[PDB]
Each structure stands twice: as structure tokens, then as C-alpha cells.
Design a protein around this ligand. Structure first.
Ligand SMILES: CCN(CC)C(=O)c1ccc(C2=CC3(CCNCC3)Oc3cccc(O)c32)cc1
Lengths: 57, 223, 286, 340, 232
């Protein structure tokens, strides 16, 4: 039954509730860190010289 | 440009040529949709139009007809209806002999009173602003073999008239045809069908030739 | 006299200024838009280059009427003339082929598919410029200059008796360039109108009958333009070739040139009409 | 649903505790937690080559793993594989059906995957001593149209989503394995991690479910939208993913805390979006809209840094190469454009 | 897959004779064909090339004009009709199937040839080595030398390796240097730059006995190289 599902679902719901959630300020700092460490590697953000660039006119 | 990239250029040229020819073989192909509504005699126009997605192909008077039949897909029509625009005409089938029984889905709904619900949903879609709608009517014999005993007044309470085959047939054709919301460029057709043959394919042939005239008039600079 | 002078000039001027410029743009407009999706597009591309050739053609001749003499040598006398009588044949034929495709498209639905592909449209374009040139090269060759009355004239000569056996060179132009085309273009559009009168789409409620009316008018204007503007020039040459009492007068030159005038003036609006009412180009402007 | 109400409420509390915790250490905006960042200048891109070949609208474009090959799917019944640098076609696969809506390219260069609107998926082999491209399997067993098909780190485990279920498989045996479930609407976007062992999805309702292939149960569910979900993608780190809906608002979510990060939106844009990608640097984000343009949106700020509008129809596909050199976009105008 | 040739025998000077090659087991209309001639106790030579669709038929240098060659797709037949006999053309003839695209392996499959007999610039590229005695289990390094930089602005070089067991037709081991062929063990390897090209075998066994060849593909005339045999 649904309840079985429920029981399951609730159970399914039950498995979603028991999780160790972290602080959001810590996830936003990791996002900024990843973005600043790999900034020089991006060819779309940082423009590429015409000779290094494989795509040419 | 390297004695090897030149062959890659020749191979690419051969693939492009073959793709262009196959796409041209398929432009001169008339594509119809056969969106019906449940067990409403669809298998019959199909039943004799020849003499997931269902594909039908036939020919008549030097013209090839392939029909796309979809009844199995019980999913959100709004997300796959946008893969069927560019079609010439949407055969839509209504069983005349469907105002008496009761659909198995619910005791309140009337087979037909939904029949025209599915007809209204498909005629005002935004992807179908300029497309002809062929309309067929099935099982006329059942309609004229029990229309005396059963009053057509059971459904459509606004009906005031006798119980003759001619009057009932006129009333049902007008109240089906009067669902179109833009008569300027979209047209609706009506025909009566039975077990008789050779009198149904030719209607399909006339409707489709009217659609081709409108398209050439539209893409030549006249209309 | 000076009035009529500055006039035609203006006339041709106006007409010339108005034609060239107009051809200029269309040619390109068609260039960046649709560009050979439909056959109407390759056909209108033909009409552009065809009229463009005539814009370069007319100012030199107006300058002669303007001077009654030709200051340039011989290259132009040839260069100028054939440039002219090819444009003529190319324009006439391109408007006739455009009309035949319309009738077939509108009157034979089933065989109109294997026939209205751009692949075969490009091929019709090539047989045209090419079929004409073939018609146009003989003049290029047979162009001569001659002096008379202190004035040079760029006339054409034949080793025939010049009155009996080679003056029919000019009556044939008349038939092939006026009779058949007019006739062929008139019958095709007449047949086109009856079946469109019978169809179930452009007819019915006066609601969209007005639309039957526009198609009726377009089909009605171009036929008439071509009938009116190109007509006067053929009627005069045959008169000239008919009447003998009057020749070399101080009033008739005005006309001749008055009338060749309205000629280049067909050319001008000529591409001019297929850019002002073309519905697929109307949606483009919108 | 009494208990559901209680524990969903507990989780909203949790969510509220996390939020309380979010508001505690963070302005939550995670934008003022970046108020000290330096703006990025305008990025004006340019086309490099325009990709012809098709005749109808393009419904799929997946990049290869050497950033060299490209596969697209059209509605004429043709899957075309070619070479980008040089814009040359390498192969041309016909199909038995002609209603495909998605395609996949195995990260081994040996197989491709196509399927849509025919209940049956098809895995095609390319390297054949025979010399021609032939079918290798024809997965069946679904009761609907296939939305997305993909490959799981190997040419022996494909992953799918169709009407209402996401099912896994095994190319050899030909039998399902670990059939996911738990959806209500109709799945229409499937992703996966770089070191793929966990993956996320998006059906017709305003929700998104992440799956884990060990057991086959939802690791997490995401909500927040008010329309469909057209296209979802991940973040190069693997701890984030970008998603889209039919309400002009793209939304970015994180796994650890389970709630949105930033929202992107402008008044002048009232149509929907239909694909979202992400460029290796983690800064720029390309979104294909129904306004015949693909506005780029730096992911740290909320400003536009370019309008790579060159299309003449609605953009149905948008892909950035594995190495971030360029990007590929595709609308219903039948030309693929390469922007670099 | 199977490919079988036929039309050899004894001819006489000034005359003429054709060679027919039948192929079964694959799609003949999507592949290109080459002809390689190898004289008795000598090296290999390229004759013609007939791409898919019969666009670009090329020919050799000393056989051009004398020779002709064609193909029949419905019958998957290839017709190479030869003109003169000069007696210097007594060789076996092998047909080779190849295919060209991004990631292709040209000269995959070869085929036994017929033993014709007759009654009686190019990028020079030679191999200094003529013979090396080998014992099992000993690593062996062979070296090829060119006369032009085989690299191209594309970023790749055009060098192919071939092995011939005694008493049969050759096979592919190493196409472009840093690429290994299909159906060959991982023992072999290849490397090089500019002009210096090298082929290495870590562990060598009995079956490894044969004649080794290295060849160029950068320019229209295909140039082969003499054989660094390996007796035991
Ligand atoms: C020959 C009569 N006379 C004196 C007897 C003239 O002066 C005179 C009159 C008209 C013209 C023509 C002008 C163009 C040619 C191409 N379109 C631009 C002008 O059209 C023509 C078509 C057909 C016949 C034509 O004659 C012309 C030339 C000369």
C-alpha cells in the first residue's frame, strides 16, 4: 500500500531526514576558492592569445 | 591539405551528397496525423485506408501517404506535441454512434461530450494556428438503427427537433464544426462514413490537395 | 524647346535615377534574406541583375539625344548596343518563366512537387541567360558606325538588300518579343484565376474574399504594366516601318525619344513592382 | 500524509536550522559573502565556424572526450558525427525510427546512443571490422518515450529516463539493473558527477532528484521552481549543479546544505530557458533562451557579460568542450554555431 | 571478412594482361583500395589508388600510363588492366583495403596475391640496417631514416610499420608513431622525431621472425623502405 509505500515512502521520507547538514557560509567560501584557484586556466574567462588558441579564423 | 586530410574532405563531400538526396526523396511526402479518442473506430478508417508511434504508408493517384498513429503514449501531450508541427492535416475521427453509451473512464462524462473536449484541445493549440482538420464520422448504420428507439435529447439538452436521420446528423455536424476560434486561415472538414469503401480514401485525397494549393500559394509570393 | 529638353532629361533622369537606385538595393536585400530557399527567390535574383544591366545602359543614349551626336569611338558603339538588346531579351523571358511556374504550382498539385525543387530552378535560370546571350551575340558582332549630316550614328547593317531580306530581323523581334510572351503570360494567368476561383480556401465568406480580390488585382496590375509600357515602342517602329510620308521632323524626335523613354521606364518599376507587393518580402519588412 | 507533514516539517526546521545556521554565518545571499570580489569585464565572443548539414530542427548535441568530435541528432532520422576544428563529417548513422529527442556519446569513442518517442533505445557500434556502422543492441522494456540516454564510465553500463522511471542497464546481457523510481511527473534532464558514482535528474513537477548507483535510491531532492525543468547540469567541482525551468529563472543549488545559492533574472527576459552549461574556470555560465540569443551570466555576480545572439530560432542545445576552449550551440534553425 | 585476387601467369613482352580482385565479408563501396607489388626477394611498391566513389584515381611513377585499373561496385570487383609487359614487372601483387577519417587506420587488411611472371620529389627514406641475429628474450631496436621532416602543421607525422612472416602476406603493427594497430600484442613500440624514427621489441619469441618495413604517407608518391630482416 501507499502506506506501505507510505511506510516505505515515509520510510523513503524517513531516509531523507537523517542527514548531517553543514553551514552555508562554508559552501559559499568553497565556491569562491574553487573559482579563484582555477581562474587562470579558463580560456572563455581569460582571453587566449591567437597563436595558443586552437580555433582560428 | 596533407594528402590525408584531402581524403577526409572527399569522404565528407560524399556523405553530404547522400544526405541531401535522401532528404529530397522525403519532401514530396504528405504526412498526416491520426489523433483519435479511445475506441472510436480509428482502426477502421485505418482499417481500410490502405486498400509506440504507429506508422502507416499507402499510395493513391501517384501520391504517397504515410500516417502517424499515436495512442499508446499516455504522457504529457504538451511536451511531445511540439514534435509534430509542419504536418498537412490532422485526421480526427468521431463515432456518431457514441452519444448513447458511457465511457469506462467515468459515469458522468459522455463519450461524445469528451469527444468534443479532445477536439477543442487539439484545435486551439499554439503550434497548430494554420493547419487543416479532417473530420470523419463512423458507424452510420448504428446511428440509423437505434435513433428511433433512443431520443437524441438524452445529451445536448438545447436540442428542439424531430428524430430523423437528416436533422440529427445536421445538428451534430454544426455543434462540432462551431468550435473553431479563428476562421480566417484554419479550416474544418466533415464527411459521413460506413463500411462502404472507395468513398473514404478519395475524401482524404481531396482534403490533402486543397492543403497543397494553399501552401504553394503562400510560398510563391501570391497569397 | 529647352523646357522639353531639361524635361525628358529630367524624365529619363528621374526614371534613370529612380531605376538604378531601386535595383541597387533589392539586389542586395534579396542577398542577405532568404537567398534561394524558394524558387521565387532565384527568379527575383535574375530580375535584379537583368534590370541592373539596363541602368548602366540608358544614360549614354539620353546623352546622344542630348547631343544628337556620339563623342565616343567604336568600342562603346558596340559595347553599348548589345548590353542593351540582351537585357531586353533576358527581362522578357524571366517574367514569362516566373508566370509559367505560378500556373503549374497553382493548377497541378500532385506534379508540382517533383518539379518545384530549387535544384531544377537553378537549372532554368542557366538555360535562360544562356538561351538569350545566344540570341544577343549576333548583334554584338554586327555593330557598325557611320557618318551623316555632320553627325555620327551607331546603326546596324546587313549585306542583304537592307529593305527586303534583312528588314524582317526587326519584325521577328516584334512577334517573339510581344506576341508569344504576352499571349503565353495571359493564358497562364487566366487559367490560374478560374481554379483559384474554384478552390475552397481563398473563396467562401466575403470575410476572406477580399483576399481573392488582392490576388485578382496583382495578377491584374503586372499584366497591364507590361502591356502598357512595353507596348508603345513596338507600335511606333512598325508605324515607322509602315508610314512613309513623314521622316526627319523637329517634333517627332521628341516623341521617339519620348517613347523609348517610357521603355526604360518599364524596366525601372519592373523590379520595382515585385518589391512593393510581394507578401513574403512584406513579412520581411514587418 | 500526517507523519510526512511532521518529518517534512522537521526537515524544513532542519532546513531552517541550516538556514539559521546559513543566516548565522552567512548573509545567505552568498553574494554579500562575496561582496569583496572584483567584477569581471565584458566578454565579447565571436563565432568561429557555422555548422551546416541538417534540414530540420536539431534536438541533441553531445561533445566527445577529446574535445574534437561532435554528435548531433536531427528530426530527419540522421545522427551525424564530425570533426570540429575542421568542421568535417566523419560518419552519418541512419535510423529505423525518426523521432529521436536525445543522443549520447560513450567516453570511449566506440559507441553512440540514440532514442526518443519509440520506447526502444539503440546502442550503435562504430569500430567494426566489417567497415560499416551497425546496431549492437536495441534496449526495450519501457512504456514510454526516452528523454535522455547516457553512458556510465564504460561502454557496458548505459543510464536512462523516459516517461516516469530512470532505469539502468548492462549492454551485454540486455537486462535492466537497479531500476530507479520515485518520480511523479515525466523525467526530462539527466546528469551525472565527473568521477561518476552519484547523479541528479528533473521531471515535469518543480522538483529534482539525485541518485546514487550503489543502491538506487534518491540521495537528495531539490525544489524551488514554478515551471518545468528543461535542462540541468553540474559544477566542475561536483558539489554543485546548475538547473533550468520554463519560467526564465535559472537556479543554482548545493549538495551539502540543500538549498539554492543565487538566482538570475532580468525584466527584459520573460521567455524560458532551454540549456545550461558551465565553463571550466567556474565563473562564466551560458544559458540558451527562447529569445533567439544565449546570454552569458558570470556565476559569482549576477550581471551579463555578453549576448552571444546569432541565432534565428529557439536554442535547443548548448555545449562547452571538455577543455573549455569553446562552446557549441544549436536552435531549431538547423545550424550549429561554434562560438570562441 | 575475405578478399581473393586472380589473373596471373606467364606473359610475353609488349603484350597485355588484367588482374581481378574479389572481396567478400565487408561493404566494398565505402573503402578505398591500393595495390602493392613486391618482387622476388626484394621490397614493396605502391601501384594505384581508387577512392570511394571513384573520384581520385592516382597512379604510380614508373607504371603511370602503362597501367590502368578500375572497380565494379555491383560485382565488387576491381579491374586493373595493365598495358605493356617489360619483364621488369614480374612480382606478386597484393590488394590492400584502407579507410581515411579522424581516427582511421589505413592499410588494415591485406590479401594473398597472384604470382605474376613475365617471360624474358618523393621523400627518400631508407633504413641503414640490413640484418640482425636475434635470440629469444632479447630486446631489439630497429631504426629508419628519412630525408624530410614528416611532421605537418596539423601536429602529426605519417609513418607506417609492416611485418611479413615467411610464406605469407604482410600485416600492420604500428601506424602513426604513438599509435598501436589492432590484433597485434603490446610487445612492440615505436617512437622518434624529425628524421630519427625508431621501432622497439621488448620480448621477442619464435613467431616474431620476418622482414620489417617502414613507409611514408605525407605526399602523393608513397615511398617505402628496404627490409631490416631478423633471422634466427
Ligand atoms: C528603330 C526605330 N528608330 C528610328 C527609325 C529609333 O530611333 C529607335 C527606336 C527604339 C529603339 C529601342 C529601344 C530599346 C532597346 C532595349 N531597351 C532599351 C531601349 O528597346 C527597343 C526594343 C525593340 C526595338 C527597338 O527599336 C528598341 C531603338 C531605336
Amino acid at each position: 500500500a501507499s502506506i506501505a509505500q507510505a511506510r516505505k515512502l515515509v520510510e523513503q521520507l524517513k531516509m531523507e531526514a537523517n542527514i548531517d547538514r553543514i553551514k552555508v557560509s562554508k559552501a559559499a567560501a568553497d565556491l569562491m576558492a574553487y573559482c579563484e584557484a582555477h581562474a587562470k586556466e579558463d580560456p572563455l574567462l581569460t582571453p587566449v592569445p591567437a597563436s595558443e588558441n586552437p580555433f582560428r579564423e | 591539405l596533407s594528402a590525408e586530410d584531402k581524403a577526409a574532405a572527399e569522404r565528407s563531400k560524399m556523405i553530404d551528397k547522400n544526405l541531401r538526396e535522401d532528404g529530397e526523396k522525403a519532401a514530396r511526402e504528405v504526412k498526416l496525423l491520426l489523433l483519435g479518442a479511445g475506441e472510436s473506430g480509428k482502426n477502421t478508417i485505418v482499417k481500410q485506408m490502405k486498400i509506440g508511434i504507429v506508422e502507416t504508408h499507402f499510395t493513391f493517384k501517384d501520391l504517397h501517404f504515410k500516417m502517424f498513429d499515436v495512442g499508446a503514449q499516455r504522457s504529457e501531450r504538451k511536451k511531445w506535441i511540439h514534435c509534430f508541427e509542419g504536418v498537412t492535416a490532422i485526421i480526427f475521427c468521431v463515432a456518431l454512434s457514441a452519444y448513447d453509451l458511457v465511457l469506462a473512464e467515468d459515469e458522468e462524462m459522455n463519450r461524445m461530450h469528451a469527444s468534443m473536449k479532445l477536439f477543442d484541445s487539439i484545435c486551439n493549440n499554439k503550434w497548430f494556428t494554420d493547419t487543416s482538420i479532417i473530420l470523419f464520422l463512423n458507424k452510420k448504420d448504428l446511428f440509423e438503427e437505434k435513433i428511433t428507439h433512443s431520443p437524441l435529447t438524452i445529451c445536448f439538452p438545447e436540442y428542439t427537433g424531430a428524430n430523423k436521420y437528416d436533422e440529427a446528423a445536421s445538428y451534430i455536424q454544426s455543434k462540432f464544426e462551431d468550435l473553431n476560434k479563428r476562421k480566417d486561415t484554419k479550416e474544418i472538414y466533415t464527411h459521413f462514413t460506413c463500411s462502404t469503401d472507395t468513398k473514404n480514401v478519395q475524401f482524404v485525397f481531396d482534403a490533402v490537395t486543397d492543403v497543397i494549393i494553399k501552401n504553394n500559394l503562400k510560398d510563391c509570393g501570391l497569397f | 524647346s529647352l523646357a522639353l529638353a531639361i524635361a525628358i532629361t529630367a524624365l529619363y533622369s528621374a526614371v534613370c535615377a529612380v531605376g538604378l537606385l531601386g535595383n541597387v538595393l533589392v539586389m542586395f536585400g534579396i542577398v542577405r534574406y532568404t537567398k534561394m530557399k524558394t524558387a521565387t527567390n532565384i527568379y527575383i535574383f535574375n530580375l535584379a541583375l537583368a534590370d541592373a544591366l539596363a541602368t548602366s545602359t540608358l544614360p549614354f543614349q539620353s546623352a546622344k539625344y542630348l547631343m544628337e551626336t556620339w563623342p565616343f569611338g567604336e568600342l562603346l558603339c558596340k559595347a553599348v548596343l548589345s548590353i542593351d538588346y540582351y537585357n531586353m531579351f533576358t527581362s522578357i523571358f524571366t517574367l514569362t518563366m516566373m508566370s509559367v511556374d505560378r500556373y503549374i504550382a497553382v493548377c497541378h498539385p500532385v506534379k508540382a512537387l517533383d518539379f518545384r525543387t530549387p535544384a531544377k530552378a537553378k537549372l532554368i535560370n542557366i538555360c535562360i541567360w544562356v538561351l538569350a546571350s545566344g540570341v544577343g551575340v549576333p548583334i554584338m558582332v554586327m555593330a557598325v558606325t557611320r557618318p551623316r549630316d555632320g553627325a555620327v550614328v551607331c546603326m546596324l547593317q546587313f549585306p542583304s538588300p537592307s529593305w527586303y531580306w534583312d528588314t524582317v530581323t526587326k519584325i521577328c523581334v516584334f512577334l517573339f518579343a510581344f506576341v508569344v510572351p504576352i499571349l503565353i503570360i495571359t493564358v497562364c494567368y487566366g487559367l490560374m484565376l478560374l481554379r483559384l476561383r474554384s478552390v475552397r480556401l481563398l473563396s467562401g465568406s466575403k470575410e476572406k474574399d477580399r483576399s481573392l480580390r488582392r490576388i485578382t488585382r496583382m495578377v491584374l496590375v503586372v499584366v497591364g504594366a507590361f502591356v502598357v509600357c512595353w507596348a508603345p515602342i513596338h507600335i511606333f517602329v512598325i508605324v515607322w516601318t509602315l508610314v512613309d510620308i513623314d521622316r526627319r521632323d523637329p517634333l517627332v524626335v521628341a516623341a521617339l525619344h519620348l517613347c523609348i523613354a517610357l521603355g526604360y521606364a518599364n524596366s525601372s518599376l519592373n523590379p520595382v513592382l515585385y518589391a512593393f507587393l510581394d507578401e513574403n518580402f512584406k513579412r520581411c519588412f514587418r | 500524509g500526517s507523519e510526512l507533514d511532521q518529518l517534512r516539517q522537521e526537515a524544513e526546521q532542519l532546513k531552517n536550522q541550516i538556514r539559521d545556521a546559513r543566516k548565522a554565518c552567512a548573509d545567505a545571499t552568498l553574494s554579500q559573502i562575496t561582496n569583496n570580489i572584483d567584477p569581471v569585464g565584458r566578454i565579447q565572443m565571436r563565432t568561429r565556424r557555422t555548422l551546416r548539414g541538417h534540414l530540420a530542427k536539431i534536438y541533441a548535441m553531445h561533445w566527445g572526450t577529446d574535445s574534437r568530435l561532435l554528435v548531433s541528432a536531427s528530426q530527419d532520422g540522421k545522427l551525424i558525427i564530425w570533426d570540429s576544428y575542421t568542421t568535417n563529417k566523419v560518419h552519418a548513422i541512419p535510423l529505423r525510427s525518426s523521432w529521436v529527442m536525445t543522443c549520447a556519446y560513450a567516453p570511449s569513442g566506440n559507441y553512440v546512443a540514440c532514442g526518443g518517442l519509440d520506447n526502444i533505445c539503440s546502442i550503435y557500434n562504430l569500430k567494426t571490422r566489417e567497415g560499416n556502422v551497425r546496431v549492437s543492441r536495441e534496449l526495450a522494456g519501457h512504456t514510454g518515450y526516452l528523454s535522455c540516454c547516457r553512458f556510465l564510465d564504460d561502454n557496458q553500463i548505459v543510464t536512462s529516463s523516459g516517461d516516469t522511471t530512470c532505469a539502468l542497464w548492462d549492454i551485454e546481457t540486455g537486462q535492466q539493473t537497479t531500476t530507479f523510481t520515485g518520480h511523479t511527473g515525466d523525467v526530462m534532464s539527466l546528469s551525472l558527477a565527473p568521477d561518476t558514482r552519484l547523479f541528479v535528474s528533473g521531471a515535469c513537477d518543480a522538483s529534482a532528484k539525485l541518485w546514487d548507483v550503489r543502491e538506487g535510491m534518491c540521495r537528495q531532492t531539490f525544489t524551488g521552481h514554478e515551471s518545468d525543468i528543461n535542462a540541468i547540469c553540474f559544477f566542475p567541482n561536483g558539489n554543485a549543479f546548475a538547473t533550468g525551468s520554463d519560467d526564465a529563472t535559472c537556479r543554482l543549488f548545493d549538495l551539502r546544505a540543500d538549498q539554492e545559492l543565487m538566482t538570475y533574472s532580468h525584466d527584459n527576459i520573460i521567455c524560458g530557458i532551454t540549456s545550461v552549461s558551465f565553463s571550466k574556470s567556474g565563473r562564466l555560465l551560458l544559458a540558451g533562451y527562447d529569445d533567439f540569443n544565449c546570454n552569458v551570466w558570470d556565476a559569482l555576480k549576477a550581471d551579463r557579460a555578453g549576448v552571444l545572439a546569432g541565432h534565428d530560432n529557439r536554442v535547443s542545445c548548448l555545449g562547452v568542450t571538455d577543455d573549455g576552449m569553446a562552446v557549441a550551440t544549436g536552435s531549431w534553425d538547423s545550424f550549429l554555431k561554434i562560438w570562441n | 571478412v575475405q578478399l581473393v585476387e586472380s589473373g596471373g601467369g606467364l606473359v610475353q613482352p609488349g603484350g597485355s594482361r588484367k588482374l581481378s580482385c574479389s572481396a567478400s565479408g565487408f561493404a566494398f563501396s565505402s573503402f578505398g583500395m591500393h595495390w602493392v607489388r613486391q618482387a622476388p626477394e626484394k621490397g614493396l611498391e605502391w601501384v594505384a589508388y581508387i577512392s570511394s566513389g571513384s573520384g581520385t584515381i592516382y597512379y604510380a611513377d614508373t607504371v603511370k600510363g602503362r597501367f590502368t585499373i578500375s572497380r565494379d561496385d555491383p560485382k565488387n570487383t576491381l579491374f586493373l588492366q595493365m598495358t605493356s609487359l617489360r619483364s621488369e614487372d614480374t612480382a606478386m601483387y597484393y590488394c590492400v583495403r584502407s579507410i581515411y577519417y579522424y581516427g582511421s587506420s589505413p592499410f588494415d587488411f591485406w590479401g594473398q596475391g597472384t604470382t605474376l611472371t613475365v617471360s624474358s620529389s618523393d621523400i627518400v627514406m631508407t633504413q641503414a640496417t640490413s640484418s640482425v641475429p636475434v635470440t629469444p628474450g632479447e630486446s631489439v631496436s630497429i631504426s629508419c631514416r628519412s630525408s624530410k621532416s614528416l611532421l605537418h602543421s596539423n601536429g602529426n607525422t605519417y609513418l607506417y610499420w609492416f611485418l611479413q612472416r615467411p610464406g605469407q602476406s604482410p600485416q600492420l603493427l604500428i601506424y602513426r608513431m604513438s599509435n598501436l594497430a589492432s590484433g597485434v600484442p603490446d610487445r612492440f613500440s615505436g617512437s622518434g622525431s624529425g628524421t630519427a624514427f625508431t621501432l622497439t621489441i621488448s620480448r621477442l619469441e619464435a613467431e616474431d621472425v620476418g622482414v620489417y618495413y617502414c613507409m611514408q604517407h605525407l605526399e602523393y608518391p608513397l615511398t617505402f623502405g628496404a627490409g631490416t630482416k631478423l633471422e634466427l
